[PDB]
Design an enzyme around this catalytic site. Structure first.
Site, PDB file in Angstrom:
ATOM      1  N   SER A  14      36.951  33.391  74.089  1.00 49.95           N
ATOM      2  CA  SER A  14      36.902  31.945  73.952  1.00 49.95           C
ATOM      3  C   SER A  14      35.538  31.547  73.410  1.00 49.95           C
ATOM      4  O   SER A  14      34.552  32.268  73.578  1.00 49.95           O
ATOM      5  CB  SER A  14      37.170  31.231  75.283  1.00 49.95           C
ATOM      6  OG  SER A  14      36.067  31.360  76.164  1.00 49.95           O
ATOM      7  N   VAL A  20      41.600  32.425  72.701  1.00 49.67           N
ATOM      8  CA  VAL A  20      42.514  33.350  72.038  1.00 49.67           C
ATOM      9  C   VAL A  20      43.060  34.318  73.075  1.00 49.67           C
ATOM     10  O   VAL A  20      42.293  35.021  73.746  1.00 49.67           O
ATOM     11  CB  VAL A  20      41.824  34.106  70.892  1.00 49.67           C
ATOM     12  CG1 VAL A  20      42.823  35.004  70.172  1.00 49.67           C
ATOM     13  CG2 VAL A  20      41.180  33.124  69.922  1.00 49.67           C
ATOM     14  N   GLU A  88      48.600  37.289  63.644  1.00 44.60           N
ATOM     15  CA  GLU A  88      48.860  38.710  63.800  1.00 44.60           C
ATOM     16  C   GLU A  88      47.755  39.353  64.635  1.00 44.60           C
ATOM     17  O   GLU A  88      46.629  38.853  64.720  1.00 44.60           O
ATOM     18  CB  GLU A  88      48.972  39.391  62.435  1.00 44.60           C
ATOM     19  CG  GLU A  88      47.644  39.655  61.756  1.00 44.60           C
ATOM     20  CD  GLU A  88      47.801  40.321  60.405  1.00 44.60           C
ATOM     21  OE1 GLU A  88      48.284  39.654  59.469  1.00 44.60           O
ATOM     22  OE2 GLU A  88      47.449  41.512  60.281  1.00 44.60           O
ATOM     23  N   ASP A  95      36.330  43.865  67.578  1.00 44.02           N
ATOM     24  CA  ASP A  95      35.549  43.022  66.686  1.00 44.02           C
ATOM     25  C   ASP A  95      34.288  43.753  66.239  1.00 44.02           C
ATOM     26  O   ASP A  95      33.721  44.569  66.973  1.00 44.02           O
ATOM     27  CB  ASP A  95      35.185  41.703  67.368  1.00 44.02           C
ATOM     28  CG  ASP A  95      34.371  41.907  68.624  1.00 44.02           C
ATOM     29  OD1 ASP A  95      34.938  42.408  69.617  1.00 44.02           O
ATOM     30  OD2 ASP A  95      33.168  41.567  68.616  1.00 44.02           O
ATOM     31  N   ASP A 134      31.721  31.002  57.372  1.00 43.79           N
ATOM     32  CA  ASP A 134      31.203  31.551  58.620  1.00 43.79           C
ATOM     33  C   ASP A 134      31.385  33.061  58.642  1.00 43.79           C
ATOM     34  O   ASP A 134      31.771  33.644  59.657  1.00 43.79           O
ATOM     35  CB  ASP A 134      31.868  30.900  59.837  1.00 43.79           C
ATOM     36  CG  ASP A 134      31.048  31.057  61.111  1.00 43.79           C
ATOM     37  OD1 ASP A 134      29.837  31.355  61.015  1.00 43.79           O
ATOM     38  OD2 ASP A 134      31.616  30.873  62.210  1.00 43.79           O
TER      39      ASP A 134
END
Ligand SMILES: COc1cc2c(-c3cc4c(Cl)ccnc4[nH]3)cn(CCN3CCN(C)CC3)c2cc1OC
Length: 273
Positions: A14, A20, A88, A95, A134
């Site tokens: 978050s 998410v 998806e 990450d 970004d």
């Protein structure tokens, strides 16, 4: 509809991008990510082709197509106080920010493969008329099995244009000096600047600038051993004057970008998958 098509799993993260959740579409057990965005925090709104939606939805629809490199929007729902976006979800995934935290500075062979895939993804966004604004390791996902990278979080983006931008709500330490001094930038050389920050971050393990005055000075010190070709490409992307920065074509023709690994050989060698 109405939340019966998806089983909700753990919260993945978050922040400024909302919340998410890991998810699974019940129709075919497809791994998905469920992103909730409160309407009160949405600053930019767009309008779909023949309805008032957040700009993030507009941008995602323009880039969601067969090309993998951008996490695709599968569906979206409107709630009274929020928007819910179905995206998806690769499995397994990590990450790029946390990948760099665990491994430190990346080998140039690995950074080359990662950086190349980021370029291909950004080129795809620009071809679709979308400026991300970004680009950073936090907004890049690694498909650990296939070795493929994915752009995420278009919540600060805009439609690509050839005129000057006077607004910006991305990450400041990735913003170019012309934004810091003048609050003005053009889309693609600002993007190239952020790609320069990203590349330095990959090969050194951290970003080169933390304060406004270091961005303004534009002086790049390398704390890790980095080849002269990689240093040259980074300093080129970090040129103070936007017009001195390379185009995407010049980046991908640079001597350091030659003979990139394919994604699956990247995973076999460096992700041991
Ligand atoms: C799967 O594991 C993670 C996923 C994420 C996501 C994330 C995943 C994702 C997907 Cl799969 C689709 C669309 N957006 C996503 N965000 C976003 N985040 C957090 C990203 N940033 C991590 C660093 N933190 C300081 C700021 C937030 C994730 C963190 C995860 O593990 C720590």
């Amino acid at each position: 509809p109405l939340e019966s098509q998806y089983q909700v799993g753990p919260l993945l993260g978050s922040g400024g991008f909302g919340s998410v959740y890991s998810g699974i579409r019940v129709s075919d057990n497809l791994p998905v990510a469920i992103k909730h965005v409160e309407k009160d925090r949405i600053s930019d709104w767009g309008e779909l082709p023949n309805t008032r939606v957040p700009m993030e939805v507009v941008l995602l629809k323009k880039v969601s197509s067969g090309f993998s490199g951008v996490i695709r929007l599968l569906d979206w729902f409107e709630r009274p106080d929020s928007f819910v976006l179905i995206l998806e979800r690769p499995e397994p995934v990590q990450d790029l920010f946390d990948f760099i935290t665990e491994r430190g500075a990346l080998q140039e062979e690995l950074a080359r493969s990662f950086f190349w895939q980021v370029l291909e993804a950004v080129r795809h966004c620009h071809n679709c008329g979308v400026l991300h604004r970004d680009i950073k390791d936090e907004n890049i996902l690694i498909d650990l099995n296939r070795g493929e990278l994915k752009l995420i979080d278009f919540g600060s983006g805009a439609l690509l244009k050839d005129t000057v931008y006077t607004d910006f709500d991305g990450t400041r330490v990735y913003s170019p000096p012309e934004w810091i001094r003048y609050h003005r930038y053009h889309g693609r050389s600002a993007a190239v600047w952020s790609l320069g920050i990203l590349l330095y971050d990959m090969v050194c393990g951290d970003i080169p600038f933390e304060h406004d005055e270091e961005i303004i000075r534009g002086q790049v010190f390398f704390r890790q051993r980095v080849s002269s070709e990689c240093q040259h490409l980074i300093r080129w992307c970090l040129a103070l004057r936007p017009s001195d920065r390379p185009t995407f074509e010049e980046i991908q023709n640079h001597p350091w970008m030659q003979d990139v690994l394919l994604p699956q050989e990247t995973a076999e060698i460096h992700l041991h998958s």
